[PDB]
Amino acid sequence: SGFRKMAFPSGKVEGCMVQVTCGTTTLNGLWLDDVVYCPRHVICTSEDMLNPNYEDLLIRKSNHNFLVQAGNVQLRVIGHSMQNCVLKLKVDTANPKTPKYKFVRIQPGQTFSVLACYNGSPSGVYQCAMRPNFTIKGSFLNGSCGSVGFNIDYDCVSFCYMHHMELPTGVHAGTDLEGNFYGPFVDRQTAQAAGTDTTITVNVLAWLYAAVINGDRWFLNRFTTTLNDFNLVAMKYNYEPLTQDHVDILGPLSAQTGIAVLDMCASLKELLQNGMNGRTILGSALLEDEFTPFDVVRQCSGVTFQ
Amino acid sequence: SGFRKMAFPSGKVEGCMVQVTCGTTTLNGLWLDDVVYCPRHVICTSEDMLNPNYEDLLIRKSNHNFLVQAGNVQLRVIGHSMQNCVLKLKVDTANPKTPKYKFVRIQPGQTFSVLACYNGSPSGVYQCAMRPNFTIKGSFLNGSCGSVGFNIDYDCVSFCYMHHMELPTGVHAGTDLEGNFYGPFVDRQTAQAAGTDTTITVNVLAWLYAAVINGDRWFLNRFTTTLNDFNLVAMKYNYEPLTQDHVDILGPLSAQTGIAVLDMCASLKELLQNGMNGRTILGSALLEDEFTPFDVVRQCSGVTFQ
Ligand SMILES: *[C@H](O)[C@H](C[C@@H]1CCNC1=O)NC(=O)[C@H](Cc1ccccc1)NC(=O)[C@@H](NC(=O)OCc1ccccc1)C(C)C
Numbered sequence: 001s002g003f004r005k006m007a008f009p010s011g012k013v014e015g016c017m018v019q020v021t022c023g024t025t026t027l028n029g030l031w032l033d034d035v036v037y038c039p040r041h042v043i044c045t046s047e048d049m050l051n052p053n054y055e056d057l058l059i060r061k062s063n064h065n066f067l068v069q070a071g072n073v074q075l076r077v078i079g080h081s082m083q084n085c086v087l088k089l090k091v092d093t094a095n096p097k098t099p100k101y102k103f104v105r106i107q108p109g110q111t112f113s114v115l116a117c118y119n120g121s122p123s124g125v126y127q128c129a130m131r132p133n134f135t136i137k138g139s140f141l142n143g144s145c146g147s148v149g150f151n152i153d154y155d156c157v158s159f160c161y162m163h164h165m166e167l168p169t170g171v172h173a174g175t176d177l178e179g180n181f182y183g184p185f186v187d188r189q190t191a192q193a194a195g196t197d198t199t200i201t202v203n204v205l206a207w208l209y210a211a212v213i214n215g216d217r218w219f220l221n222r223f224t225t226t227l228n229d230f231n232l233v234a235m236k237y238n239y240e241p242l243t244q245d246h247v248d249i250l251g252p253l254s255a256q257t258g259i260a261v262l263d264m265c266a267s268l269k270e271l272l273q274n275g276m277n278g279r280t281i282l283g284s285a286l287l288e289d290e291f292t293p294f295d296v297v298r299q300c301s302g303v304t305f306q
Numbered sequence: 307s308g309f310r311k312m313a314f315p316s317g318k319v320e321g322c323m324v325q326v327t328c329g330t331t332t333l334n335g336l337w338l339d340d341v342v343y344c345p346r347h348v349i350c351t352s353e354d355m356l357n358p359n360y361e362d363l364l365i366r367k368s369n370h371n372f373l374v375q376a377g378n379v380q381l382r383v384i385g386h387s388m389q390n391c392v393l394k395l396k397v398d399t400a401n402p403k404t405p406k407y408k409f410v411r412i413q414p415g416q417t418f419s420v421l422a423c424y425n426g427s428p429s430g431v432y433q434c435a436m437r438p439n440f441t442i443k444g445s446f447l448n449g450s451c452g453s454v455g456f457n458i459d460y461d462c463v464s465f466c467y468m469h470h471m472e473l474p475t476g477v478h479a480g481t482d483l484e485g486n487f488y489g490p491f492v493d494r495q496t497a498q499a500a501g502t503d504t505t506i507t508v509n510v511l512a513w514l515y516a517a518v519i520n521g522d523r524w525f526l527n528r529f530t531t532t533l534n535d536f537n538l539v540a541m542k543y544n545y546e547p548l549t550q551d552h553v554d555i556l557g558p559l560s561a562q563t564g565i566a567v568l569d570m571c572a573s574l575k576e577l578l579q580n581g582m583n584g585r586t587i588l589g590s591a592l593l594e595d596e597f598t599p600f601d602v603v604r605q606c607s608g609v610t611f612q
């Protein structure tokens with residue numbers, strides 16, 4: 001029993017974290033096979049960042065201008081290219097610790113773990129969600145760029161996020177591992193707007209199910225509601241619209257708890273309309289939306305990986 | 307910027323997780339050098355658990371009754387002993403992945419990461435605190451026993467916790483790695499009381515400092531207070547008494563933020579007396595006490611490990 005924001009074991013990802021230096025700037029890179037991936041703004045000076053022309057800047061660089069250090073040992077860069085907002089450094093030595101991996105572009109509302117890194121060394125690991133507005137609420141200081149987000153499926157690492165920048169919000173933006181940004185963001189130090197975030201309704205319901213599985217049932221109410229009546233309430237509270245695909249995804253939790261999804265929405269509706277009255281659910285005084293139905297199921301069935 | 311409940315990278319600990327079977331029961335073990343550690347209740351049948359005599363039960367066992375599996379590969383058990391509530395299995399092969407380690411018995415209020423395991427395979431990793439009443443608020447299902455808590459200092463793993471049992475509370479109890487329980491608990495399936503928990507005042511203040519470092523300053527008030535006046539307020543709210551040793555520990559955060567510790571207590575006092583009024587601090591609608599001053603400092607300076 002118990003329910004915790006839990007991240008995947010980071011060991012498989014730790015072994016791929018390298019330090020990338022080009023000019024004065026140093027950031028983290030991902031070493032898979034004989035390719036090291038990192039944000040292309042590593043080739044930027046502080047003044048370049050205000051308005052960079054990445055083609056022109058990169059043309060000034062050659063292979064030897066890229067310092068790639070894996071702990072103590074050294075990659076010889078024998079090829080470099082820019083794919084979207086990522087730099088790909090071809091090295092002469094495949095990482096002997098390369099795990100089974102795939103590059104995945106996740107959907108808003110999905111979750112993944114972040115292995116925060118500085119100078120190519122892991123600092124810490126934490127879960128979060130791709131917000132509906134394609135930002136993440138992370139913990140990132142200077143030199144954290146190139147730190148990656150990932151999920152594990154038994155033995156395969158799915159890389160889904162590479163960190164590039166912090167917005168004027170304390171929120172974070174970045175790319176998938178083909179270097180395409182999540183959201184409308186560009187890698188330029190210029191004012192940029194995330195847009196209205198919304199709460200991931202299907203994650204909230206899955207978390208309400210997690211609560212009932214762990215004895216927290218006080219919010220379970222006498223009522224039910226309709227999919228359209230609840231979506232009216234949801235739009236008032238900047239909750240994303242619940243669909244039938246979401247209902248189907250909550251099916252297993254529904255079957256485990258013997259609580260219909262629409263009975264759960266009705267509890268959720270009275271929580272949105274009356275608040276929590278100073279109560280807590282799973283140790284939180286707010287509605288939590290960074291657990292997917294899969295997150296919940298996995299933590300209350302005990303799926304492991306290696 | 308940003309502030310997240312962050313756990314240590316688990317890679318070094320993943321490499322020590324083995325599966326231990328004795329009779330029908332299977333749990334996790336910690337493989338360091340040529341010794342595998344695990345809870346002694348692995349030798350218990352479900353009926354033994356109600357009132358076990360561990361000496362008598364263990365005498366019925368020999369080395370070959372212990373099945374230790376490291377992924378696919380196999381330890382030959384060549385010696386077993388009971389140290390307090392832990393079983394020590396001598397195996398013929400030292401773990402080639404043994405990291406620099408030490409066994410540490412932590413203090414209430416300190417934090418550590420948990421690598422939750424099932425059948426010797428890591429499932430997930432999360433932070434928490436040893437409560438003042440020597441329980442942890444974890445996430446543990448059946449087969450999680452033997453999962454360990456730890457901290458890392460550069461390259462040295464300090465093991466501090468091994469999971470043994472869940473209480474009638476959904477809270478968790480366990481031992482250090484010499485097999486001494488944290489708290490008054492015994493490894494017997496019999497009703498057991500944790501006692502009144504309290505909030506870790508020094509962790510709360512460190513988190514308030516974390517808030518100010520990240521722009522959340524609304525709680526900063528016009529007032530100051532005295533160490534004894536604040537401790538009066540603290541005792542009313544089941545907060546642990548703030549001491550000068552705690553003040554000295556908060557010194558660096560004090561110097562970084564230019565906010566005196568007692569000015570912070572005065573903010574804390576008005577938060578305890580008037581609540582948060584529906585506001586949040588660092589994305590929480592409750593006062594958070596599972597970050598030590600060290601946790602805060604480390605996340606806002608970027609210390610790394612390997
Ligand atoms: C990489 O190590 C670093 C990590 C940052 C620092 C603190 N938290 C983080 O996530 N990232 C950066 O320094 C990038 C550098 C960059 C260079 C060239 C192109 C793009 C990015 N910059 C930022 O994260 C900065 N954010 C923005 O510039 O975002 C747009 C913006 C918003 C308001 C005003 C101007 C520009 C950040 C403010 C340091």
Ligand SMILES: *[C@H](O)[C@H](C[C@@H]1CCNC1=O)NC(=O)[C@H](Cc1ccccc1)NC(=O)[C@@H](NC(=O)OCc1ccccc1)C(C)C
Pocket residue numbers: 001333347350354355356446447448449450451470471472473474478492493494495496497498
């Ligand atoms: C080990 O894999 C397992 C993990 C448990 C299951 C779910 N969450 C957990 O942390 N732990 C156990 O099953 C232990 C087994 C045990 C056997 C012999 C001696 C001690 C423990 N048992 C428990 O965690 C149970 N908790 C208690 O028995 O605690 C005292 C108590 C409280 C109320 C009523 C009777 C006894 C737990 C209730 C399964």
